[model samples]
Target chain A: VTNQLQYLHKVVMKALWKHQFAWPFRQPVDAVKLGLPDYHKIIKQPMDMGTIKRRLENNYYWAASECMQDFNTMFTNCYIYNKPTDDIVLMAQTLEKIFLQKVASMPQEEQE
Target chain B: PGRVTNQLQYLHKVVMKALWKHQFAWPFRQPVDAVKLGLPDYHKIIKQPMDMGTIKRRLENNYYWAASECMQDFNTMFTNCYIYNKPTDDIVLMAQTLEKIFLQKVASMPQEEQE
Candidate 1:
């Protein structure tokens, strides 16, 4: 990921942490009680879903030939099905993969 | 370790099915074979038909209504509540609805009589 993208990710994570207590139910309590580390507390922060979606969309658009391209196709072609010449696709996939790796490395948390 | 391994195996199957259903675009618009995913036998599963009265009664029950609303407004609830994208009023309503449902269900259960 570019330095700008990385910084943006951090910023959004920080925002999420600041606003996380606002979530309904014991979400804020569970995070602490379950010993789940705050994104801001970790070395690499977690990106909020909205921010991640936006960033991924931006990256996909930059990588794709058209804006109408679907997200799954953007993910698949950019990573697995691309021909030899699609450097943009490769870069987008690498960035997404790196972000996904970060999330995967985190502790078990509620998904749905 | 064995339990965790088994749980992981089950989780893997769920993830794979979800990916096939939602993530990967089907080549054609052909319906997925639910049987291949080890789903319940739809053919044998009796569909108990309900009338408007049953539907109305269900809507009036706190538990049924809450669960139904949760399913119906799942996307809205998920996006607005847990994800922290929207405000909390709707989520609060949902929680209250569920709590009432749980209370009603408990009340409806028969109490054990003293011998």
Candidate 2:
């Protein structure tokens, strides 16, 4: 349970940091200006709906069910509900400042 | 200490995701558009830095539009140009447009504190 909780927490943290820290350059124009590739092409899909459906039916459901169960269980046991409201609020405040300052200090080319 | 860290991590995740999805979609094409979209509520966020609720709301709205519409524009402009090979002037025009907005935002700031 501890390991599962920690892993989920890390996943959430990584997503958060990626979102916050990358906010300024989220624009492709800014990214191009900062010398990043124009398109990532991270997701590729099948051209045929039949193939996609077949593949989904063959492989996706079982994994998805397990994934959903894990998510439900992990969130259910998460420690956040036990923390004081004030502590959570304070932590958010600190994180916001950290992200803001980090963006403000980025190179002008990147920020623009 | 671990408990506090966990709490902080959890809070950070919630706040970050809220800002990312509800406020700003990631990979915007033009950041300026998002900035423009948030102009209506900019005063609310700028006025009270310590008011977390108002600030987060303002930031979310601003980031959302900036990434969504502006990103669409960026993608369209780039795709229409065919990898910026032909009619390269459009790319320059877009860059200038972004720069104009960037400078305008800076100009709006106090001179003494301008970055």
User: In TM-score terms, which candidate is top?
Assistant: 1
Q: Which DockQ-derived CAPRI band holds candidate 2?
A: incorrect
lDDT of 2 by residue, B1-115 (tens): 0122221222234433333343222322223232655545434323222222332343444432221222222223322222222223344334323323322232122212121
The sequence of per-residue lDDT tens digits that candidate 2 reaches over residues A1-112 is 2322222234422333355433322222222564535222311110222222333435433322232232222221111121223243233333333322222222222111
Q: In model 2, how large is the Cα lDDT of residue A30? A: 29
Per-prediction TM-score, chain A only?
0.29, 0.23
Q: After superposition, how far is residue A89 of candidate 2 from its true place, in Å?
A: 2.1
How close is chain A of candidate 1 to the true chain A, as a TM-score?
0.29
TM of each candidate vs. truth: 0.23, 0.18
Collision count for each candidate, in order: 0, 10
Q: What clash pairs does model 2 have?
A: A26-B28, A27-B28, A28-B28, B23-B60, B23-B64, B24-B63, B24-B64, B29-B71, B30-B70, B34-B66
